[PDB]
């Protein structure tokens, strides 16, 4: 479609000035709203960008192919970054969200100046000796299976597991909160596109900088993701956020707006 239209239905907006920008992008089950503690910080000095995937960025509004993929994510990204006619942007994605900020970079690398990735992992299945993403194959289905026979008993036994964190109860019922609002249908179609996506041999394509931000204790994207990400992309570097669980940006807005502005601080 055109400018207007890819501004509608990816709820584009900007907000802030400066000569950089920063595209913020949700991760699973979340739409620009789990941004809210974090980047404003950034408008001070940056014309921040918000939006919400078309693949139901834990909303309404859509054609079924396009989203099977992670690809018709990063075409998302894409599209909005020509929808606002941008020559350059930092991206901070979260989750899937830098997966796809990353596969993007692949396509139009003079797009991205740098790939801030808050709790990748470029794949879940366990593959010992070598790789492990935290997940038996079998877990995985286990949990697409019980996304579609109950989806709401599904969207708060994940919120759980997303956050590890038992004595924070107002992040997992906001976390289980947006998962109940996804449409249950693209929620899956969209879940399926990241537990089985694979992309460690795409790591090497990577040329943009990124700055990996790996949280602890976290059971969707355990440190050995993080570390493995970073032996792999040719161009980065890890930090170990304090911050626990998968949703940092959520539960530790504070340290992830210091580790993301000292990164661009630097980096100019």
Same mark, same amino acid.
């Given at each position: 479609?055109?400018?207007?239209?890819?501004?509608?239905?990816?709820? !584009?907006?900007?907000?802030?000035?400066?000569? *950089? @920008? +920063?595209?913020?992008?949700?991760? %699973?089950?979340?739409?620009?709203? &789990?941004?809210?503690?974090?980047?404003?910080?950034?408008?001070?000095?940056?014309?921040?960008?918000?939006?919400?995937?078309?693949?139901?960025?834990?909303?309404?509004?859509?054609?079924?192919?396009?989203?099977?993929?992670?690809?018709?994510?990063?075409?998302?990204?894409?599209?909005?970054?020509?929808?606002?006619?941008?020559?350059?942007?930092?991206?901070?994605?979260?989750? !899937?969200?830098?997966?796809?900020?990353?596969? *993007? @970079? +692949?396509?139009?690398?003079?797009? %991205?100046?740098?790939?801030?990735? &808050?709790?990748?992992?470029?794949?879940?299945?366990?593959?010992?000796?070598?790789?492990?993403?935290?997940?038996?194959?079998?877990?995985?289905?286990?949990?697409?299976?019980?996304?579609?026979?109950?989806?709401?008993?599904?969207?708060?036994?994940?919120?759980?597991?997303?956050?590890?964190?038992?004595?924070?109860?107002?992040?997992?019922?906001?976390?289980?909160?947006?998962?109940?609002?996804?449409?249950?249908?693209?929620?899956?179609?969209?879940?399926?596109?990241?537990? %089985?996506?694979?992309?460690?041999?795409?790591?090497?394509?990577?040329?943009?900088?990124?700055?990996?931000?790996?949280?602890?204790?976290?059971?969707?994207?355990?440190?050995?993701?993080?570390?493995?990400?970073?032996?792999?992309?040719?161009?980065?570097?890890?930090?170990?956020?304090?911050?626990?669980?998968?949703?940092?940006?959520?539960?530790?807005?504070?340290?992830?707006?210091?580790?993301?502005?000292?990164?661009?601080?630097?980096?100019?």
């Amino acid at each position: 479609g055109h400018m207007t239209s890819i501004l509608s239905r990816n709820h !584009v907006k900007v907000k802030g000035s400066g000569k *950089a @920008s +920063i595209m913020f992008a949700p991760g %699973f089950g979340c739409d620009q709203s &789990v941004w809210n503690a974090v980047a404003p910080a950034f408008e001070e000095d940056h014309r921040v960008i918000l939006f919400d995937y078309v693949g139901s960025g834990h909303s309404d509004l859509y054609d079924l192919n396009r989203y099977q993929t992670l690809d018709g994510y990063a075409q998302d990204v894409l599209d909005v970054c020509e929808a606002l006619d941008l020559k350059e942007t930092v991206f901070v994605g979260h989750s !899937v969200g830098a997966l796809i900020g990353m596969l *993007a @970079s +692949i396509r139009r690398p003079e797009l %991205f100046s740098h790939l801030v990735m &808050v709790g990748p992992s470029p794949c879940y299945l366990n593959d010992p000796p070598e790789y492990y993403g935290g997940f038996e194959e079998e877990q995985l289905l286990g949990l697409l299976e019980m996304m579609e026979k109950n989806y709401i008993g599904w969207a708060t036994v994940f919120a759980a597991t997303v956050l590890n964190q038992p004595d924070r109860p107002e992040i997992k019922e906001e976390l289980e909160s947006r998962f109940c609002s996804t449409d249950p249908v693209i929620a899956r179609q969209f879940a399926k596109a990241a537990f %089985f996506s694979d992309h460690r041999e795409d790591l090497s394509k990577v040329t943009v900088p990124s700055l990996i931000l790996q949280c602890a204790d976290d059971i969707i994207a355990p440190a050995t993701v993080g570390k493995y990400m970073h032996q792999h992309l040719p161009y980065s570097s890890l930090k170990q956020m304090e911050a626990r669980g998968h949703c940092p940006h959520m539960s530790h807005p504070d340290e992830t707006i210091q580790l993301i502005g000292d990164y661009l601080k630097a980096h100019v």
